[PDB]
Structure formats: structure tokens, C-alpha cells
Amino acid sequence: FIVEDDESLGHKELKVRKGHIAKLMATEYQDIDVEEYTWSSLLNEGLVEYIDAEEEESILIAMQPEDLEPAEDVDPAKRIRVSHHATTFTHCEIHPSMILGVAASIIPFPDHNQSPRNTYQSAMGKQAMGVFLTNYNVRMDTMANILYYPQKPLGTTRAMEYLKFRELPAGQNAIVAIACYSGY
Amino acid sequence: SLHKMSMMAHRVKVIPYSTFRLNLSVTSPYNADFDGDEMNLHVPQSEETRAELSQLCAVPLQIVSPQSNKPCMGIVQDTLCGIRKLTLRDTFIELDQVLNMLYWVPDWDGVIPTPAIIKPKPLWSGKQILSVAIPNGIHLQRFDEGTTLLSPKDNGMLIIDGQIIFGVVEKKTVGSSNGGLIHVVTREKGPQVCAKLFGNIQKVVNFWLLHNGFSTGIGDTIADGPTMREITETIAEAKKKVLDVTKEAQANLLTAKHGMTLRESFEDNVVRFLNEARDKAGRLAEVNLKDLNNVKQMVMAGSKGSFINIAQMSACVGQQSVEGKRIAFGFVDRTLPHFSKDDYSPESKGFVENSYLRGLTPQEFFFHAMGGREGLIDTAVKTAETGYIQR
Amino acid sequence: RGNLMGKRVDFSARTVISGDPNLELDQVGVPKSIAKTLTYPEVVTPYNIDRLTQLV
Amino acid sequence: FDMGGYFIINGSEKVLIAQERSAGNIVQVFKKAAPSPISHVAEIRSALE
Amino acid sequence: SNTLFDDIFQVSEVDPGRYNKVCRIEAASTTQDQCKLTLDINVELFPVAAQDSLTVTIASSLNLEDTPATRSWRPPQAGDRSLADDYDYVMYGTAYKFEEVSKDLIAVYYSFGGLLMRLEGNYRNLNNLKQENAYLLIRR
Amino acid sequence: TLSHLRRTNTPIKPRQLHNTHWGLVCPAETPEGQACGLVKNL
Amino acid sequence: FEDESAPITAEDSWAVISAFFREKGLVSQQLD
Amino acid sequence: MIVPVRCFSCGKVVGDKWESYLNLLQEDELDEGTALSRLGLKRYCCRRMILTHVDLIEKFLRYNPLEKR
Amino acid sequence: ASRHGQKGTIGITYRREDMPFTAEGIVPDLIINPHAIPSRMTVAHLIECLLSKVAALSGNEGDASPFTDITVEGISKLLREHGYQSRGFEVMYNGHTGKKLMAQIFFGPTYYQRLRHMVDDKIHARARGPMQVLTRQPVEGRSRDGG
Amino acid sequence: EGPQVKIREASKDNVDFILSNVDLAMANSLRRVMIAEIPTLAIDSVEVETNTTVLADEFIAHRLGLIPLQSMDIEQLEYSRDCFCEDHCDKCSVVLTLQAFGESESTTNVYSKDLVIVSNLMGRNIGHPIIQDKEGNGVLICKLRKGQELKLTCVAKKGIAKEHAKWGPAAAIEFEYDPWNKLKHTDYWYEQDSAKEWPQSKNCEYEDPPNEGDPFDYKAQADTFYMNVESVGSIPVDQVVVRGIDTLQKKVASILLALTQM
Amino acid sequence: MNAPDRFELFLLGEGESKLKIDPDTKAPNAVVITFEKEDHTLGNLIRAELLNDRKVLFAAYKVEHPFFARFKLRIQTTEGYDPKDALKNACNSIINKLGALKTNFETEWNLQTLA
RNA sequence: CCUAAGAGUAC
Numbered sequence A: 001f002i003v004e005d006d007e008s009l010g011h012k013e014l015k016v017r018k019g020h021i022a023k024l025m026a027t028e029y030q031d032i033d034v035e036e037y038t039w040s041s042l043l044n045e046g047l048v049e050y051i052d053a054e055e056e057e058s059i060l061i062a063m064q065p066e067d068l069e070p071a072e073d074v075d076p077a078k079r080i081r082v083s084h085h086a087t088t089f090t091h092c093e094i095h096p097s098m099i100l101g102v103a104a105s106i107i108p109f110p111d112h113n114q115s116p117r118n119t120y121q122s123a124m125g126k127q128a129m130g131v132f133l134t135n136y137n138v139r140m141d142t143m144a145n146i147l148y149y150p151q152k153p154l155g156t157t158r159a160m161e162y163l164k165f166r167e168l169p170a171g172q173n174a175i176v177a178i179a180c181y182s183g184y
Numbered sequence B: 001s002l003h004k005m006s007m008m009a010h011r012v013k014v015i016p017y018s019t020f021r022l023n024l025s026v027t028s029p030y031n032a033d034f035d036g037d038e039m040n041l042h043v044p045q046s047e048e049t050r051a052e053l054s055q056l057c058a059v060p061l062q063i064v065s066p067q068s069n070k071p072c073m074g075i076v077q078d079t080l081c082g083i084r085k086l087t088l089r090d091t092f093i094e095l096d097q098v099l100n101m102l103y104w105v106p107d108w109d110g111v112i113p114t115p116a117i118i119k120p121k122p123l124w125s126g127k128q129i130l131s132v133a134i135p136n137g138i139h140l141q142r143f144d145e146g147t148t149l150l151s152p153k154d155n156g157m158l159i160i161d162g163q164i165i166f167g168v169v170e171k172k173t174v175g176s177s178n179g180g181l182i183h184v185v186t187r188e189k190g191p192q193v194c195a196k197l198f199g200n201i202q203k204v205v206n207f208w209l210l211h212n213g214f215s216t217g218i219g220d221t222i223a224d225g226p227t228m229r230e231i232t233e234t235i236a237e238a239k240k241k242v243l244d245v246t247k248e249a250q251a252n253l254l255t256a257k258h259g260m261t262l263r264e265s266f267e268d269n270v271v272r273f274l275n276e277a278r279d280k281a282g283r284l285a286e287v288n289l290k291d292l293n294n295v296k297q298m299v300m301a302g303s304k305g306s307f308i309n310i311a312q313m314s315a316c317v318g319q320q321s322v323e324g325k326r327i328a329f330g331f332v333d334r335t336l337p338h339f340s341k342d343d344y345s346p347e348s349k350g351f352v353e354n355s356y357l358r359g360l361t362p363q364e365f366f367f368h369a370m371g372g373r374e375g376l377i378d379t380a381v382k383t384a385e386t387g388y389i390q391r
Numbered sequence C: 001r002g003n004l005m006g007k008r009v010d011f012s013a014r015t016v017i018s019g020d021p022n023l024e025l026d027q028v029g030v031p032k033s034i035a036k037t038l039t040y041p042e043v044v045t046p047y048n049i050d051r052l053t054q055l056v
Numbered sequence D: 001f002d003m004g005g006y007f008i009i010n011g012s013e014k015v016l017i018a019q020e021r022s023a024g025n026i027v028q029v030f031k032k033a034a035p036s037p038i039s040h041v042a043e044i045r046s047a048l049e
Numbered sequence E: 001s002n003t004l005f006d007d008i009f010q011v012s013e014v015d016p017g018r019y020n021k022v023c024r025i026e027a028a029s030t031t032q033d034q035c036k037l038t039l040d041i042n043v044e045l046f047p048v049a050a051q052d053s054l055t056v057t058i059a060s061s062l063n064l065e066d067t068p069a070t071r072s073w074r075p076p077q078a079g080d081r082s083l084a085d086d087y088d089y090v091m092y093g094t095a096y097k098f099e100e101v102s103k104d105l106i107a108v109y110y111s112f113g114g115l116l117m118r119l120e121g122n123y124r125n126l127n128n129l130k131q132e133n134a135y136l137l138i139r140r
Numbered sequence F: 001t002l003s004h005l006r007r008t009n010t011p012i013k014p015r016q017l018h019n020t021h022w023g024l025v026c027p028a029e030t031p032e033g034q035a036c037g038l039v040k041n042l
Numbered sequence G: 001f002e003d004e005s006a007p008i009t010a011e012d013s014w015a016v017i018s019a020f021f022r023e024k025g026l027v028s029q030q031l032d
Numbered sequence H: 001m002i003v004p005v006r007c008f009s010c011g012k013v014v015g016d017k018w019e020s021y022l023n024l025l026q027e028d029e030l031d032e033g034t035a036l037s038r039l040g041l042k043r044y045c046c047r048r049m050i051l052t053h054v055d056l057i058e059k060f061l062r063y064n065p066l067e068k069r
Numbered sequence I: 001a002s003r004h005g006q007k008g009t010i011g012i013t014y015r016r017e018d019m020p021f022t023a024e025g026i027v028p029d030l031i032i033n034p035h036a037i038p039s040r041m042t043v044a045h046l047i048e049c050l051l052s053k054v055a056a057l058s059g060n061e062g063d064a065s066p067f068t069d070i071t072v073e074g075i076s077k078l079l080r081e082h083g084y085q086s087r088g089f090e091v092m093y094n095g096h097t098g099k100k101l102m103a104q105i106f107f108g109p110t111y112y113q114r115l116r117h118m119v120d121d122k123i124h125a126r127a128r129g130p131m132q133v134l135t136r137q138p139v140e141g142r143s144r145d146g147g
Numbered sequence J: 001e002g003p004q005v006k007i008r009e010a011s012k013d014n015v016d017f018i019l020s021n022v023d024l025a026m027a028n029s030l031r032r033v034m035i036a037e038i039p040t041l042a043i044d045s046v047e048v049e050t051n052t053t054v055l056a057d058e059f060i061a062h063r064l065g066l067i068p069l070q071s072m073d074i075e076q077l078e079y080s081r082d083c084f085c086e087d088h089c090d091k092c093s094v095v096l097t098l099q100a101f102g103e104s105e106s107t108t109n110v111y112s113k114d115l116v117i118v119s120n121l122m123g124r125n126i127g128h129p130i131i132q133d134k135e136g137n138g139v140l141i142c143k144l145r146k147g148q149e150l151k152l153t154c155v156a157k158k159g160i161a162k163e164h165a166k167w168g169p170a171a172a173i174e175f176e177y178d179p180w181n182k183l184k185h186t187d188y189w190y191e192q193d194s195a196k197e198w199p200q201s202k203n204c205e206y207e208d209p210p211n212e213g214d215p216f217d218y219k220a221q222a223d224t225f226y227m228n229v230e231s232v233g234s235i236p237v238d239q240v241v242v243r244g245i246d247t248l249q250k251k252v253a254s255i256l257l258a259l260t261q262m
Numbered sequence K: 001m002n003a004p005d006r007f008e009l010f011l012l013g014e015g016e017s018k019l020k021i022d023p024d025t026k027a028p029n030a031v032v033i034t035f036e037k038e039d040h041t042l043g044n045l046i047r048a049e050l051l052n053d054r055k056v057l058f059a060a061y062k063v064e065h066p067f068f069a070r071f072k073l074r075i076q077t078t079e080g081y082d083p084k085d086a087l088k089n090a091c092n093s094i095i096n097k098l099g100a101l102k103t104n105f106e107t108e109w110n111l112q113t114l115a
Numbered sequence L: 001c002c003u004a005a006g007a008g009u010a011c
């Protein structure tokens, strides 16, 4: 996201507002008659920008807009966050959860895990068994493994509906008990 | 198979499933889990090889390792936690369960021990039933910290003539430790009796734990409100001390420790402050945990877990380090593009003040990922180098 | 190193391991198929003629 | 749901793994160890597209 | 069979400790000023409060008849007569230490299945206790 | 399949997770073996 | 919502991400 | 693939409650929880059996049959 | 394996009557050891089990996205509003005897993957078989009946 | 005289009752028998003639094996293992036939109402698939695109849940005792207060709450078990309970018979 | 592959019987009875009913391995009382109690109108 | 059959 001065509010703010979000929602709903509003529309109107590491060296990024853009009884259950005590941002992260890859986006609550466990799951979900393609019945692959009853996870992430994980799940919801039952 | 105990002679038991099955206590010398480990089996083809395999490489003969003149096999995992829970002073067993537990010991002599309590209800203590497994004539006496001949805390261990006089049975007694029960039994009665002891203890404790139950959950990682407030206060105080040290260094008033530069001394002080902050918060959390806490029970038994695990899950994950240092400035003078230049605050260089229960902020998540990556790389390099050195 | 110090051998099995609290310390559980594959040669003796004949 | 981005060579689906390399036409300066006589080396991997 | 020791004590302190069913009590003899007792009691099965008078008897057996454990314990049949009928709370344990506290005071340590007891007093009446098994009988 | 189609390999500390990797490659997705850190995912 | 120039929330960014994946896809780099 | 006949854990028959569930979701605009409670799925084993099912068979039916009579 | 690096093989399989059961008759599909939790510090596993329990009871879907403001306390409050113990513990009874277990069991739905490593594709034994043509030693690999 | 039963709720598929004046072992054995040892009818063998659908043959065979069938008169059927026929006959099996064709442009749903009994039931009350929903269509067995066909035959034998869970008629069985924890058979995990953090069971209304000052009753045993039996549909739930008791009694009687005969 | 047939859980194999009784030398007047193709369902019930008896000094059972459906039950009674007689009395009491329970349940169910 | 390459399991 691009952050500009926004002299009307007297403080730094994202260039994207509720109108653009509404237009994007309208376009998505129409896809599922008004003027189309795609990602290229955001790109061409200076709403979002493409930044690589070299350019990322010379910018200041806000992690989330709602907590870092506006200037300054808290829930003890919530994790501790800081405001960075600085207002000179040039860009804003679209979402922090987008730092993860395809395999790590399946992990539920990856921030509550020890990092090697996340690495293990990333390497191990590629070996998970499910439905790799819907046309597996007309493909002569050397080896194929299909679940009888794939189930979409009860605990799901927002990023896994762009990976079609709810359409082609690779696991099942089993009733698990954590117990030293029999020693086996 | 890095050592001779990783290659031992067993007795075949033909079973109707597609996996090798082995006792839990023998997994330690093999360094074997059941998360997909495969193992190999070789069959001798002559009477000479068969005989020398049974008389030299047999599992009971390997119980005491020459590697450190102490037993290499012990009570582990569920049996250790169960044996700690069973020998508590609160544990009393009624007649029916006592009979079932006595029958489960294969070499039980057939006499029911007189109950520890006769009136108004016959009750057997857990120590009384466990002493049936211990062979007759074994004497053991270990004095823990602060224990007397009377045991107000029930710590230490006194076993007289194969009867547990007092002490909670835990890792220091039935684990693979020098001077423990395994060592004494194998040096007094022989390897065969020690293997029989392994079997009897496992059977009785596993039966009792099956009919008592043991679990762990998210609530075991939760400390109450006042403890969380004290932990947050401790973290804030440590961060304030770090800020004061930073002010002193930035005013050049800080003096360099002899043998290191100014920056190295400052980093050393900051790391020490953050480390002791994490330790103090973890100790607060551990003290707050009740005796019914399941993670606390596993730690006390020694079966699994440690103080640092409780600290990181409940109080504070701590300072993430790469190459023995705080998170370096990968970008120009900053760790991430979300911090300003020349920011030496604990959050800017990889201090995770949130526990795993609370969850990590994105920057803390990335720093923890860097630490875990360093750990994995070190593991791979270490296993390769150790293999070469061993050869 | 590949054929003299260490070599592939016959009469060997390999498979996944599982825990069993009901097995003795010196016991190992062997799948029935593996036990049916691996064999031991027993010399025919007056002391074991009957059971060897039965196994045959 | 198939996303494409792969070739079919002799009936087998082949994917080209993205190969990482150092960028060209960038000047990089590196220190050198004590035994070497040269202390610092500035190099450019010049290449024309 | 006979009562090796018998006295009346007053409880001065009850310590729950980390337990929910067992409490450690300290008691002072109400007749001899040199005799004191420390004892773990299953309070769930026999409640004990502070300033409570308990008659305590240590015996070598429970049968009324004289002695003619090594014999397996059997459930008490109906109509069986034993010393325990006259008391409320009975434990069985072994003596594991005879300590010389002073010139006249000695202490005897008993372990009833892990419940510990220490009885201290002058040897003139604690001499009957010896290194063997014993029954502890308590009535309120 | 998706992870394979977005995979990068580095011919051969280069194995470490660098700071500049933020938002460009997955912080925790890499083989445990000899390719730890060398093989990355977008 | 009613105001056209009101600032967005953390929930609104998922709409932007949806648009991105509606145009790019998951294997956009290979095809491009 | 297609709705399981029975709940895995307890064994309650749920293979006849899929079309009713879809009808409740679509025609009556009921949320998932109320629709599950209406069909008689009170234990969360059955609720996860019906709630998390993915009806992939529709996709399979889209392709033309290999052996058409 | 779960989605948190908690791999493991099936030790044994019990029928329904032998598994521990809650007061509602629910028996687990899987039982995993507590000792896998403390050392590995997979708190996300427990949080996801709790969230999945709440989602199954309420009919909604659990939002387990990483950096959201979803806390254990809120999930526990929802679970308590559903009439269960807030921390996911349930009183369970032993299958063999029907007696209550002295310890309450952490119980709930969790997402598991079946991995490609099955025992039937790995079991292998060789008494005598084909030999290498050059060294006259057993061939390599279970696909070739090797040694 | 003996065990006493009082039933709270009676339904077509559920019975909720109280089992008083009985040992814990007896109640648990009854529960286990109801779970496992009750004979029932279910499809056991599937001969597939034609399958042009999108599902595998053994997939459909498994689904058919999980279809609940009427088993009211299952005691009149014999086990296939102890019948004199070769593979299956009328004295020990019921033969059904599923023949479906996709002659409609829209998807055609193959339910369990299309299962047709072929073998002569000889007047028994077995074989009919159990229909529960109001629409009348049974379990959704398969789906057919236009032109797809599914022809197969099923043989159903009697069986118990021990051999395979598809023969279990008992679903979930609620089983509770001592709602107030007066016997102290559990130690309640808690953070601040055990009473506040553990919700009271619905059965707590049927027992007197403890006085909180009385001493622990060490002589008290366990009785008055609150049990709720659910029925899949193969047999009525009351018949589930009665046949569970009958099967347990048969097991004990067989033990006596073996003891006497040896 | 190596998985045993499920009917082996309850069907007696060839050449084996339901019960076998062996005297116990550890204690006087004690027997060990091996029940084949049985499990906790019968073992717990028999053990509890035996413990209800007044002349039974010891009664316990154990399933030595979950793989195999069999269990061992040790019974020791007072002098002059046959352990087999104790087993007979326990089985008879169980049968009587179950019959009474079945009768009571039938009578209670006959009183319903909303079934 | 050999060779090479790649992916992966447990350390």
C-alpha cells in the first residue's frame, strides 16, 4: 500500500479508501453491470506499488494500517504490540500473513508454534494425501493417492481460500484426545 | 548405530502386524522414536553365532554401559510420569485395584501385603504396591536437597529390603542414572533380575496410569491474572534497564569492559538483562503453576519438558540469537524495513516478549524463524561432522 | 569400503518400529510375514527330530 | 483448478525451478583474509543482455 | 499382641502441605513431658483438628490372644475380633530407625506405606519398641 | 504442486534466513537435509 | 462504507489481496 | 468426495442429511449451526462430519462420461 | 501428522468399546501422548483443537489466521457459552471398566494428514535371493528383493 | 428384586433412563455389549456388474456396507459361517439389487430407497433399508450424470460390531454416574475454583448436592447410572437395550456351559 | 498384509477351548483360568461378582496383550471352598441380576406412550 | 542390466 500526506486529515494515511474497496467488492460480486475494477486499476491509479529488496532498503513500512497510521484498559489476553513511536511511513503492508509461502499458509496459528515445527509442517504437508486434481480419473499418472472423504479444516486461515484448500483438502478432522491412555 | 548398545540381541516374539515391536525402555540406547523410524534385524545362522549373540550381545547384559559406568536404559515417558504420580503420599488404592495391580506382576509371590491403613477402610499406598515389583534384599538411600530422616517434602529416597520406606519415585531413582535403582539392582542381583524389574515396574505403573488417566491441554499453559501482570511488570522493568543502558552508551558514559570494545560490552549487558528477565518471568510462571498442572507434573517426573519450556510457553519466549549475537542489521542499519535506522531496542533486534500462548507479532515471528533456521542448519552440520569424526 | 569392510547381507529384515509396554526388555516383536521369510538352519538331531519333522 | 506453468515433455510434466544467481553489473567490494597479500577486492560481473 | 506402647497426645499443629488427603500432625503427650509425636494421617479417612486429644497405641499384633507380615492379608470376616475394634484409625508399618536423641531420649521412626511417624521419649517406656513391624491405633 | 511451481534453487552463511528475505520467500519452508536454506519458496 | 474517502480497516485489505489473486494467480511468474 | 454414510466417531447415519442441509442453507437462509441443529446433529462429531464435507463429486460429474450408454 | 509438525505412527488400534468416552458417548478417533506437547511447544496444536471444538459446536468456521486478534480467552468464553469446560477438558471414563478417569482429558477435533509413508511399502525381508553379477553379493533395494 | 430401572425419555431412536441398584462393572459391561456384541444385518458382499460412474467400485461397496438395514428378526437368520450352503443362501443372507441409470439431463441421485430385495425373506422382518428423513429417500449412495449406469448386486449377512463397525446398531451411548463427584472418583482440574469452572451436568438435578461440611463417605459405592442409548435405526432402541442384556446373559451362560462340560 | 482376521476376536480357533484351568503354586487353594476369545467385557464383570463373594480371598484378571482376545483370571478362596464353585456362584448371580434387569426394563418400557 | 540426475524418510 502507498501512504501519502493526506492534508485533509492532517496525518499520514493510506491512499486506498473505502470507495476503492467497495468497487473491488462490486467487481468480485459481479464475477461470481458496472465498470470493472481490477488489481491493474489499483496499480494504475497509484494505490499500490511494487517494491523489491533494493527499493525496500530506502522505505519505511507500517505493519498494519489500523494500529500504525493514526496517532495515539487493554485486554491481557492479547499479545503485546508496539506502535514504533514514529510517523514517517511511506508504505503499508497489505497483510503480514503474506510473508508466508504456499505450504506455510495452511498452518493454523503459525505464530503460536516454535519455528522448527512450522518448517516441519511446511515440508510435511507436501506429503499429505488428498485430491491433487479433479480430473484424476482421466490421467495415467505413475502413482496417485486420493482420500475417500477429504474434509475442509475446521480451523482455517484467510490465505487458504486463494490456495483452493477448501475445495481440494488433504486431511480429515479427527476427534483427538491427548492422554496417556494405555502406554501404546 | 553410533555405539555397541545400538546393536543388541533380542528374543523373537512373533506378532500379527507389520511392525517391529520393542520395549519402551530399550529405545534410549537405540535413540529410536516411533515417528517413522525403521530398524534392522539379522538372524544368526549357526549355533556358535547364536550362542555368542545370546551370551555377549543380549539386552540385559548391556544395561550398564561401559561408556559412563552407569545404566543406559531406564524408565521413560508414560511410565516415569505414572511412577511419580503413583508414589505420592496422596495416592491410595482400594482392594480391587490392588488385587489387579498385584496380579499384573508376573513374579508376585502370591501374598497380599498388609494395607498401610487398616481402619476404617483398608487402603494400600502406591509405594506399598510398587515395592512388590522391587526385588527383595535391595537397599537404596539418596538424600536430596533439604531432606531429613523425616521427609516433609517426600523427596529423597529410602528403600529398605526392597520396600520403599519413603521418597517419591522419579527420574533420579528409576532413570538411567548412576546410583539409581537400576544400577543397584543390576549390580546386586544380576542383569536378568534387572530386566525382570523393568518389566514388572512398567506393567504395574502402566496399569495404574491406564486406570488413573493423564492428559495435557491449553489450560496447562495459562497462568492467572496476577502472575501475568507480574510477568509483564518484570519484562517492562528489564526493558527500562535496557533503555537506561542504551542512554548511558549513547551518552558515551558507558565504560568498556577490559577485553572487549564498547559495543561488545553494551551487547553483553543487554543480552544478560534480557536473559535474566526471561528467566525471572519463567520462574514466576512456574511458581504460579499448581501441583495439578500437567506440564508441571511432567517436568517434576522428569519424563519430558524443562523449566525453559514452561517459561517460553507461558511467560516469554525470550531473546532470539543468530551466530551467538542478537539479530544483525541485514538491511542498511536496520533489521527490518519496519524499524528506523540505528534502533537497538530489544524489539528491534529480536526480543520476543510474547509467549507462545499469546502469539508472536510478525517481526517476532520472523526473528524466531531466523533462530529456528540457524538451529536446523546447526543440526545438519553437527550430524555430518560427528559422523566423520566418529569414523 | 563398499564390498569388504561393509557389504549387503542375506537373512536381514527392515521395517517400521512400534512401542509395546507388554513386551519384555529383551524381547522384540517380529511380523509374521518377516518370520515366515527369514529362516534358521537347524541340524537334524535325535533331540529335535520330531518338531523339525512337524515343521517340514 | 490446474494452474499451468509447466511443460509436457514426452508425456511427463516438467517444471523449471527458478535458478538463483548473483546480479550482474553491480560493484561488490570484499575484504580478504590475513594470509592473502591483497586486502580488499572490488569486482563487477559485467554482462550485456 | 500386647500393646508395646500407649499414651494420650494433644495435637498442636496440622500441616496440609501439598496434599489433599494426608496431613502431618505434631502432638505432645499429656502425661509425660518428654514424649512427642510427629505423624502423617489420612485426614480424608480420619479428620483431625488442632487441640484434639488422641489416644495412641503401638502394638505388635491385633489378635487378642498372645503371639504363638509373613502371612497374606485377608479381608476381615464378619464376627472377627481384633484390637482394632476398640480404635478408630489403624495403620500398619515398619520401624526403620532407632535414633539416640540424648542421654535418655530416643526416637523411633515408622513408615506406614510411606506415611511417616516419629515417636520421641525417654527410653524407660519406649524400650518395648524394636526394629520390626507394628500397628498404630488411634482413637479420639 | 503449487509449492513445486513456486520453487527456487541456489546452486552451490548462504543457508541462513536473511533479513532481506522478508516478504519475498517463505521464512519457514525448506528441506531439512543438505538443501536447508539453499532451496527456497516464494 | 457510507463515506467514500474513509480510511480502510485491517479486514478490508483481504479484498485487495483477492483482487491481486484474481488478476495474477499463483503461478503468474512462470507464465509471464 | 461424496457425503459419508455414517459419522466416523459415533456412527450416526448422516448420509441422508446432505440434501436437507443444503436446502436449509439455500432456501431458508439459515446459518450452518442452526441447520445442523435442525437435522438432529447434536454431538460435534456429527456436526463436523456434515459441516466440513466437500462435495467434490459435482466436479467429477462435470467431465463427460468415459463409457456412455 | 497434525498441521504443527506432530508426526507419528499408529501404535495400536482399539475398537470403540475400548476407547475412553465422555458423558455424551463421544469417543476419540485418535489418542496422542501428552509428552509430545511440552518439549516441542506446539501451543498452536492446542489452540487449534480448542478453536475447532468451538467451530464444530457453533457451526461457524474457526479463523486461525496467524496475526489476527483471536485469543485463547475468547475461544474459551465461546466454548463455555456452549456448555463445556472453557479450557477443553472433559471428564472421561475408562473403556474397560467404566470408572471415571482421575484426570480430565483434553478432547476435541483436530485436522490430521495421512502421510505417504505406509508400513506396507517399507516392510522388507530377504533370506536368500538374487545376487549381483559382479561382486556376487546381494542386490540393492527392496524392489529387487535386495539385501 | 435386583437392578432397578427408571426411564426419563422415550423416543423412536433414543431412550434415556436411570439404572439404579447395580454394580459399575455390570453397567459398563452392558454398555460395551450394546456397543459391540448385538447382531445386525448389513450388506457384506458386492458383485459389480456395471459402473460407469465417477466413484470406484470398492468406494461404492463400502458405502453400501454402511447402509443400515432392518434387523428386527435378525435372530431368525443364521450366520453365513455356520450354514450348510456354499456361499450364500436364503437361510443366512438377504440379496438386494441396485440398478440405476442416468437417463435425466440433470444429476440423478442413487439413494438407498432404490435397493430392491430379491431373495425371498420367508416372512421375516429383515432386509429393508432404514428410512428416516421426511423426503423418503434413504442414504445418498451415488450420483449419475446423463448416460452413466450402475448395476450391482449385494449379499447381506448378519454380523456384530466386533467384526466390523458397519454392524453396530448402537451409535453413541451416553453413560454417567455420580454427577456431584461425591465418590471422589475424579480430581477436578481448575485454575481458580473447580465448582465455577466445571459446568453442572443435567443429571445433577436428580441427586442431593453434598452438604460441603460432611466428612467423605468412604463406604459409598457407585450406582444409579444415567444412560442414554441412541439407535442407528436397524432395531428399535428398546430392543437395543433388551438385546444387549440378552447377549451379556448369553455370554455368561456360555461360560457356565463350558465350565460344566469340561 | 499381516493384519489378522477380525473374526479371530470372538471365534474359537481349531484345537482350543473356551476355558482352561491351571492350579497356582504360589498360594494354596488358588487357580488361574484362561478365557479364550474374551475381553474386559466379561473379565471385569466376573471379577467384580467374585469380589462380592465373602469366601473369595483373591480375585483378579488381566489381558496380557491387546493383540490377542484372551484373559487370565486368578481366584483364591478359603480352605474347603472350590474356586470353580466360586466361579459358578458368580456366574449364577450375574445371570440372575441380568434377568431381573431385563424384566424391569421391559416393564418400564411398557409404560410409555410417546415411544 | 549399467550409469547419471532429481525428490524424499530416520538420524
Ligand SMILES: [Mg+2]
Binding pocket: B032, B033, B034, B035, B036, B037, L010
Ligand atoms: Mg524419530
Ligand SMILES: [Zn+2]
Binding pocket: H007, H008, H009, H010, H011, H012, H043, H044, H045, H046, H047
Ligand atoms: Zn457422531
Ligand SMILES: [Zn+2]
Binding pocket: J080, J083, J084, J085, J086, J087, J088, J089, J090, J091, J092, J093
Ligand atoms: Zn446359507
